[PDB]
Amino acid sequence: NSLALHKVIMVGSGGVGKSALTLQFMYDEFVEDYEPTKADSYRKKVVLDGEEVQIDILDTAGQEDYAAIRDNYFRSGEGFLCVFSITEMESFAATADFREQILRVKEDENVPFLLVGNKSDLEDKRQVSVEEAKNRAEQWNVNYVETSAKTRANVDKVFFDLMREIRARL
Ligand SMILES: Nc1nc2c(ncn2[C@@H]2O[C@H](COP(=O)(O)OP(=O)(O)O)[C@@H](O)[C@H]2O)c(=O)[nH]1
Ligand SMILES: *S(=O)(=O)c1ccc(S(=O)(=O)Nc2cc(F)cc(OC)c2)c2c1OCCO2
Ligand SMILES: [Ca+2]
Ligand SMILES: [Ca+2]
Ligand SMILES: [Ca+2]
């Protein structure tokens, strides 16, 4: 009677595509204006490897600055999509901070976690090399996936593959 509930948290610096990825996954729409300061949760039934489950997505927005609240939000998460934009090197640099924030709270270096390089449809504006992102993912023992919220490339993959990590590790 009770479905598995996979609790996913989007993290990453501003403008990288957290909301656009979420809204593409949820509603099959590329949304380009979503309030940068708006954090919201989303829930959908999805059939994961043939099992009906519920995904809950917390689309964070960095507005909450009070560390105890931010940590409470992370503590509740079971898996993390750590998003940067391949067109903004500083957003890639910033991923280290989210990683540490998550590790401090979850206290488990194997927490379900994907490094997501979004905006793969903007190859001509790339600032982060595939090599260096892959190297960082290797250092963290996480998978690296490049996505485009615009074209839908690997959007279902990152949510499904994270749910597979949650299923396996919890
Ligand atoms: N070209 C392109 N633009 C994107 C992609 N994902 C997000 N954007 C754009 O980047 C801006 C910020 O995206 P948003 O999801 O609001 O970033 P957030 O601050 O991480 O939630 C928006 O104007 C989006 O249209 C993508 O995959 N490709
Ligand atoms: S709450 O459900 O009232 C809530 C959720 C999310 C945010 S936020 O994403 O704007 N701030 C966060 C939340 C995180 F889990 C992590 C952050 O750093 C990655 C930032 C939020 C609230 O309520 C208060 C305002 O912010
Ligand atoms: Ca769960
Ligand atoms: Ca957003
Ligand atoms: Ca869909």
Coordinates of all heavy atoms in Angstrom, one line a residue, residues 52-116:
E52 N 6.3 1.1 -9.2 CA 5.8 2.5 -9.0 C 6.3 3.0 -7.7 O 6.3 2.3 -6.6 CB 4.3 2.4 -8.9 CG 3.6 3.8 -9.0 CD 2.1 3.8 -9.0 OE1 1.5 2.7 -9.3 OE2 1.5 4.8 -8.8
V53 N 6.9 4.2 -7.7 CA 7.5 4.9 -6.6 C 7.0 6.4 -6.7 O 6.4 6.8 -7.7 CB 9.0 4.9 -6.6 CG1 9.5 3.4 -6.7 CG2 9.6 5.7 -7.7
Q54 N 7.2 7.1 -5.6 CA 7.0 8.5 -5.6 C 8.4 9.2 -5.5 O 9.2 8.8 -4.7 CB 6.2 8.9 -4.4 CG 4.7 8.7 -4.6 CD 3.9 9.6 -3.8 OE1 3.2 10.5 -4.2 NE2 4.0 9.4 -2.5
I55 N 8.6 10.2 -6.4 CA 9.8 11.1 -6.2 C 9.3 12.4 -5.7 O 8.3 12.9 -6.0 CB 10.5 11.3 -7.6 CG1 11.8 12.0 -7.3 CG2 9.6 12.1 -8.5 CD1 12.7 12.0 -8.6
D56 N 10.1 12.9 -4.7 CA 9.9 14.2 -4.1 C 11.2 15.0 -4.4 O 12.3 14.5 -4.2 CB 9.7 14.1 -2.6 CG 9.3 15.4 -2.0 OD1 10.2 16.3 -1.8 OD2 8.1 15.6 -1.7
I57 N 11.0 16.1 -5.0 CA 12.1 17.0 -5.5 C 12.0 18.3 -4.7 O 11.1 19.0 -4.9 CB 12.1 17.2 -7.0 CG1 12.2 15.9 -7.8 CG2 13.3 18.1 -7.3 CD1 11.7 16.1 -9.2
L58 N 13.1 18.6 -4.0 CA 13.2 19.9 -3.4 C 14.2 20.7 -4.2 O 15.4 20.5 -4.3 CB 13.8 19.8 -1.9 CG 13.9 21.2 -1.3 CD1 12.6 21.9 -1.2 CD2 14.6 21.1 0.1
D59 N 13.6 21.7 -4.9 CA 14.3 22.7 -5.7 C 14.8 23.8 -4.9 O 14.0 24.7 -4.6 CB 13.4 23.1 -6.9 CG 14.0 24.1 -7.8 OD1 15.2 24.1 -7.9 OD2 13.3 24.9 -8.4
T60 N 16.0 23.8 -4.4 CA 16.5 24.8 -3.5 C 16.9 26.1 -4.2 O 17.1 26.1 -5.5 CB 17.7 24.3 -2.7 OG1 18.8 24.2 -3.6 CG2 17.4 23.0 -2.0
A61 N 16.9 27.2 -3.5 CA 17.2 28.5 -4.2 C 18.1 29.4 -3.4 O 18.2 30.6 -3.6 CB 15.8 29.2 -4.4
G62 N 18.9 28.8 -2.4 CA 19.9 29.6 -1.7 C 19.4 30.7 -0.9 O 20.2 31.3 -0.1
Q63 N 18.1 31.0 -0.9 CA 17.6 32.2 -0.1 C 17.8 31.9 1.4 O 18.3 32.8 2.1 CB 16.1 32.4 -0.4 CG 15.9 32.8 -1.9 CD 17.0 33.7 -2.4 OE1 17.2 34.8 -2.0 NE2 17.8 33.2 -3.3
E64 N 17.4 30.8 1.9 CA 17.6 30.4 3.2 C 19.1 30.5 3.6 O 19.9 29.7 3.1 CB 17.1 29.0 3.6 CG 17.1 28.7 5.1 CD 16.4 29.9 5.8 OE1 15.2 29.9 5.9 OE2 17.2 30.8 6.2
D65 N 19.4 31.5 4.4 CA 20.8 31.7 4.8 C 21.1 31.1 6.2 O 22.2 30.9 6.5 CB 21.2 33.2 4.7 CG 21.9 33.5 3.5 OD1 22.0 32.7 2.6 OD2 22.4 34.7 3.5
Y66 N 20.0 30.8 6.9 CA 20.2 30.3 8.3 C 20.6 28.9 8.3 O 19.8 28.0 8.0 CB 18.9 30.6 9.0 CG 18.7 32.0 9.5 CD1 18.9 33.0 8.5 CD2 18.4 32.3 10.8 CE1 18.7 34.4 8.9 CE2 18.3 33.6 11.2 CZ 18.4 34.7 10.3 OH 18.3 36.0 10.7
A67 N 21.8 28.6 8.8 CA 22.5 27.4 8.5 C 21.7 26.2 9.1 O 21.7 25.1 8.5 CB 23.9 27.4 9.1
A68 N 21.1 26.4 10.2 CA 20.4 25.3 10.8 C 19.2 24.8 9.9 O 18.9 23.6 9.8 CB 19.9 25.6 12.2
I69 N 18.6 25.8 9.3 CA 17.5 25.5 8.4 C 18.0 24.8 7.1 O 17.4 23.8 6.7 CB 16.7 26.7 8.0 CG1 16.2 27.4 9.3 CG2 15.5 26.4 7.1 CD1 15.3 28.7 9.1
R70 N 19.0 25.3 6.5 CA 19.6 24.7 5.4 C 20.1 23.3 5.7 O 19.8 22.4 4.9 CB 20.9 25.5 4.9 CG 21.5 25.0 3.6 CD 22.6 24.0 3.8 NE 23.5 24.4 4.8 CZ 24.5 25.3 4.6 NH1 24.6 25.9 3.5 NH2 25.4 25.5 5.6
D71 N 20.7 23.1 6.8 CA 21.1 21.7 7.2 C 19.9 20.8 7.4 O 19.9 19.7 7.1 CB 22.0 21.8 8.5 CG 23.4 22.4 8.2 OD1 23.7 22.7 7.0 OD2 24.1 22.5 9.1
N72 N 18.8 21.4 8.0 CA 17.6 20.6 8.2 C 17.1 20.1 6.8 O 16.6 19.0 6.6 CB 16.5 21.3 8.9 CG 16.8 21.5 10.4 OD1 17.7 20.8 10.9 ND2 16.1 22.4 11.0
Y73 N 17.1 21.0 5.8 CA 16.6 20.6 4.5 C 17.5 19.5 3.9 O 17.0 18.6 3.3 CB 16.6 21.9 3.6 CG 15.4 22.8 3.8 CD1 15.5 24.2 3.9 CD2 14.1 22.3 4.0 CE1 14.4 25.0 4.2 CE2 13.0 23.1 4.2 CZ 13.2 24.5 4.3 OH 12.0 25.2 4.6
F74 N 18.8 19.6 4.1 CA 19.7 18.6 3.6 C 19.5 17.3 4.3 O 19.6 16.2 3.7 CB 21.2 19.1 3.7 CG 21.6 20.0 2.6 CD1 20.7 20.6 1.8 CD2 22.9 20.3 2.5 CE1 21.1 21.5 0.8 CE2 23.3 21.2 1.5 CZ 22.5 21.8 0.7
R75 N 19.4 17.4 5.6 CA 19.2 16.1 6.4 C 18.1 15.3 6.0 O 18.1 14.1 5.9 CB 19.1 16.5 7.9 CG 19.4 15.3 8.8 CD 19.5 15.8 10.3 NE 20.5 16.8 10.5 CZ 20.3 18.1 10.7 NH1 19.1 18.6 10.7 NH2 21.3 18.9 10.8
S76 N 17.0 16.0 5.5 CA 15.8 15.3 5.1 C 16.0 14.7 3.7 O 15.3 13.7 3.4 CB 14.6 16.3 5.1 OG 14.6 17.1 3.8
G77 N 16.9 15.1 2.9 CA 17.2 14.6 1.6 C 17.8 13.2 1.7 O 18.7 12.9 2.5
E78 N 17.4 12.4 0.7 CA 18.1 11.1 0.6 C 19.1 11.0 -0.6 O 20.0 10.2 -0.5 CB 17.0 10.0 0.3 CG 16.1 9.8 1.5 CD 14.9 9.0 1.3 OE1 14.3 9.0 0.2 OE2 14.4 8.3 2.2
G79 N 18.9 11.9 -1.6 CA 19.9 11.9 -2.7 C 19.9 13.3 -3.2 O 19.0 14.1 -3.1
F80 N 21.1 13.6 -3.9 CA 21.3 15.0 -4.3 C 21.7 15.1 -5.7 O 22.6 14.3 -6.2 CB 22.4 15.6 -3.4 CG 22.0 15.7 -2.0 CD1 22.1 14.5 -1.2 CD2 21.5 16.8 -1.4 CE1 21.7 14.5 0.1 CE2 21.0 16.8 -0.1 CZ 21.2 15.7 0.7
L81 N 21.1 16.0 -6.5 CA 21.6 16.4 -7.8 C 22.4 17.7 -7.6 O 21.8 18.7 -7.2 CB 20.5 16.5 -8.8 CG 19.7 15.3 -9.2 CD1 18.7 15.5 -10.3 CD2 20.7 14.2 -9.7
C82 N 23.7 17.6 -7.8 CA 24.6 18.7 -7.5 C 24.9 19.3 -8.9 O 25.7 18.8 -9.6 CB 25.9 18.3 -6.8 SG 27.0 19.6 -6.5
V83 N 24.2 20.4 -9.2 CA 24.1 21.0 -10.5 C 25.1 22.1 -10.7 O 25.2 23.0 -9.8 CB 22.7 21.4 -10.9 CG1 22.6 21.9 -12.3 CG2 21.7 20.3 -10.6
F84 N 25.8 22.2 -11.8 CA 26.5 23.4 -12.2 C 26.2 23.6 -13.6 O 25.6 22.7 -14.3 CB 28.0 23.3 -11.9 CG 28.7 22.3 -12.8 CD1 29.3 22.7 -14.0 CD2 28.8 20.9 -12.4 CE1 30.0 21.7 -14.8 CE2 29.4 20.0 -13.2 CZ 30.0 20.4 -14.4
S85 N 26.5 24.8 -14.2 CA 26.4 25.0 -15.6 C 27.8 24.9 -16.3 O 28.7 25.5 -15.8 CB 25.9 26.4 -15.8 OG 26.1 26.8 -17.2
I86 N 27.8 24.1 -17.3 CA 29.0 24.0 -18.1 C 29.5 25.3 -18.6 O 30.6 25.4 -19.0 CB 29.0 22.9 -19.2 CG1 28.0 23.3 -20.3 CG2 28.6 21.5 -18.6 CD1 28.2 22.5 -21.6
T87 N 28.6 26.3 -18.7 CA 29.0 27.6 -19.2 C 29.5 28.6 -18.2 O 29.9 29.7 -18.5 CB 27.8 28.3 -20.0 OG1 26.9 28.7 -19.0 CG2 27.2 27.3 -21.0
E88 N 29.6 28.2 -16.9 CA 30.0 29.1 -15.8 C 31.0 28.4 -14.9 O 30.5 27.6 -14.0 CB 28.8 29.6 -15.1 CG 29.2 30.7 -14.1 CD 28.0 31.1 -13.3 OE1 27.2 31.8 -13.8 OE2 28.0 30.6 -12.1
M89 N 32.3 28.6 -15.1 CA 33.3 28.0 -14.3 C 33.0 28.2 -12.8 O 33.2 27.2 -12.0 CB 34.7 28.5 -14.6 CG 35.8 27.8 -13.8 SD 35.9 26.0 -13.9 CE 36.8 25.7 -15.4
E90 N 32.6 29.4 -12.4 CA 32.4 29.6 -11.0 C 31.4 28.7 -10.4 O 31.5 28.3 -9.2 CB 32.1 31.1 -10.7 CG 33.2 32.0 -11.1 CD 33.1 32.6 -12.5 OE1 32.5 31.9 -13.4 OE2 33.6 33.7 -12.8
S91 N 30.4 28.3 -11.1 CA 29.3 27.4 -10.6 C 29.9 26.0 -10.4 O 29.5 25.3 -9.5 CB 28.1 27.3 -11.6 OG 28.3 26.6 -12.8
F92 N 30.8 25.6 -11.3 CA 31.5 24.3 -11.1 C 32.4 24.4 -9.8 O 32.4 23.4 -9.0 CB 32.4 24.0 -12.3 CG 33.2 22.8 -12.1 CD1 32.6 21.5 -12.1 CD2 34.6 22.8 -12.0 CE1 33.4 20.4 -12.0 CE2 35.3 21.7 -11.8 CZ 34.7 20.5 -11.8
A93 N 33.1 25.5 -9.6 CA 33.9 25.6 -8.4 C 33.0 25.5 -7.2 O 33.4 24.9 -6.2 CB 34.7 27.0 -8.4
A94 N 31.8 26.1 -7.3 CA 30.9 26.2 -6.1 C 30.4 24.8 -5.7 O 29.9 24.6 -4.6 CB 29.7 27.0 -6.5
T95 N 30.5 23.8 -6.6 CA 29.9 22.5 -6.3 C 30.6 21.9 -5.1 O 30.0 21.1 -4.4 CB 30.0 21.5 -7.4 OG1 31.3 21.3 -7.9 CG2 29.1 21.9 -8.6
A96 N 31.9 22.2 -4.9 CA 32.6 21.7 -3.7 C 31.9 22.1 -2.4 O 31.9 21.3 -1.5 CB 34.1 22.2 -3.7
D97 N 31.4 23.3 -2.3 CA 30.8 23.7 -1.1 C 29.5 22.9 -0.8 O 29.3 22.5 0.3 CB 30.4 25.2 -1.2 CG 31.6 26.1 -1.6 OD1 32.8 25.7 -1.2 OD2 31.4 27.1 -2.2
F98 N 28.7 22.7 -1.9 CA 27.5 21.9 -1.7 C 27.8 20.5 -1.2 O 27.2 20.0 -0.3 CB 26.6 21.9 -2.9 CG 26.2 23.3 -3.3 CD1 26.8 24.0 -4.3 CD2 25.2 23.9 -2.6 CE1 26.3 25.3 -4.6 CE2 24.8 25.2 -2.9 CZ 25.4 25.9 -3.9
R99 N 28.9 20.0 -1.9 CA 29.3 18.6 -1.5 C 29.7 18.6 0.0 O 29.2 17.7 0.7 CB 30.5 18.2 -2.3 CG 31.2 16.9 -1.9 CD 30.6 15.7 -2.6 NE 31.3 14.5 -2.2 CZ 30.6 13.3 -2.2 NH1 29.4 13.2 -2.7 NH2 31.3 12.2 -1.8
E100 N 30.4 19.6 0.5 CA 30.8 19.6 1.9 C 29.6 19.8 2.8 O 29.5 19.2 3.8 CB 31.8 20.7 2.1 CG 33.2 20.4 1.6 CD 33.7 19.1 2.2 OE1 33.9 19.0 3.4 OE2 34.0 18.2 1.4
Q101 N 28.7 20.6 2.4 CA 27.5 20.9 3.2 C 26.7 19.6 3.4 O 26.3 19.2 4.5 CB 26.7 21.9 2.6 CG 27.2 23.3 2.6 CD 26.8 24.2 1.5 OE1 25.9 23.9 0.8 NE2 27.4 25.4 1.4
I102 N 26.6 18.8 2.3 CA 25.9 17.6 2.3 C 26.6 16.6 3.2 O 26.0 15.9 4.0 CB 25.7 17.1 0.8 CG1 24.7 18.0 0.1 CG2 25.2 15.6 0.9 CD1 24.8 17.8 -1.4
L103 N 27.9 16.4 3.0 CA 28.6 15.4 3.7 C 28.6 15.8 5.2 O 28.5 14.8 6.0 CB 30.1 15.4 3.2 CG 30.2 14.8 1.9 CD1 31.7 14.7 1.5 CD2 29.6 13.5 1.8
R104 N 28.7 17.0 5.6 CA 28.6 17.4 7.0 C 27.3 16.9 7.7 O 27.3 16.5 8.8 CB 28.8 18.9 7.2 CG 30.2 19.5 7.0 CD 30.3 20.8 7.7 NE 29.4 21.8 7.2 CZ 29.6 22.7 6.2 NH1 30.7 22.6 5.5 NH2 28.7 23.6 5.9
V105 N 26.3 17.0 6.9 CA 24.9 16.7 7.4 C 24.6 15.2 7.3 O 24.2 14.6 8.3 CB 23.9 17.5 6.7 CG1 22.5 17.0 7.0 CG2 24.1 19.0 7.1
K106 N 24.9 14.6 6.2 CA 24.6 13.2 6.0 C 25.6 12.3 6.6 O 25.3 11.1 6.8 CB 24.4 12.9 4.5 CG 23.3 13.8 3.8 CD 21.9 13.7 4.3 CE 21.4 12.3 4.1 NZ 19.9 12.3 4.6
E107 N 26.9 12.8 6.7 CA 28.0 12.0 7.4 C 28.2 10.7 6.7 O 28.6 9.7 7.3 CB 27.7 11.8 8.9 CG 27.5 13.1 9.7 CD 27.4 12.8 11.2 OE1 26.3 12.3 11.6 OE2 28.3 13.2 11.9
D108 N 28.1 10.7 5.4 CA 28.2 9.4 4.6 C 28.7 9.8 3.3 O 28.0 10.4 2.5 CB 26.9 8.7 4.6 CG 26.8 7.7 3.5 OD1 27.8 7.2 3.1 OD2 25.6 7.5 3.1
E109 N 30.0 9.5 3.0 CA 30.6 9.9 1.7 C 30.0 9.1 0.5 O 30.3 9.5 -0.6 CB 32.1 9.6 1.8 CG 32.8 10.1 3.0 CD 33.3 11.5 2.9 OE1 33.9 11.8 1.8 OE2 33.2 12.3 3.9
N110 N 29.1 8.1 0.8 CA 28.4 7.4 -0.3 C 27.0 7.9 -0.4 O 26.2 7.2 -1.0 CB 28.5 5.9 -0.1 CG 29.9 5.4 -0.5 OD1 30.5 5.9 -1.4 ND2 30.3 4.3 0.2
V111 N 26.6 9.0 0.1 CA 25.3 9.5 0.0 C 24.9 9.5 -1.5 O 25.7 10.0 -2.3 CB 25.1 10.9 0.6 CG1 26.0 11.9 0.0 CG2 23.7 11.4 0.5
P112 N 23.7 9.1 -1.9 CA 23.3 9.2 -3.3 C 23.5 10.6 -3.8 O 23.0 11.6 -3.2 CB 21.9 8.8 -3.3 CG 21.8 7.8 -2.2 CD 22.7 8.3 -1.1
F113 N 24.2 10.8 -4.9 CA 24.7 12.1 -5.3 C 25.2 11.9 -6.8 O 26.0 11.1 -7.1 CB 25.9 12.4 -4.4 CG 26.5 13.8 -4.6 CD1 26.4 14.8 -3.6 CD2 27.2 14.1 -5.8 CE1 27.0 16.0 -3.8 CE2 27.8 15.3 -6.0 CZ 27.7 16.2 -5.0
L114 N 24.7 12.8 -7.7 CA 25.2 12.9 -9.0 C 25.7 14.3 -9.2 O 25.1 15.3 -8.7 CB 24.1 12.6 -10.0 CG 23.9 11.2 -10.5 CD1 23.3 10.4 -9.4 CD2 23.0 11.2 -11.7
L115 N 26.9 14.4 -9.9 CA 27.4 15.7 -10.3 C 26.8 15.9 -11.7 O 27.0 15.1 -12.6 CB 28.9 15.7 -10.4 CG 29.6 17.0 -10.8 CD1 29.3 18.1 -9.8 CD2 31.1 16.7 -11.0
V116 N 26.1 17.0 -11.9 CA 25.3 17.3 -13.1 C 25.8 18.5 -13.7 O 25.7 19.6 -13.2 CB 23.8 17.5 -12.7 CG1 23.0 17.8 -14.0 CG2 23.3 16.2 -12.1

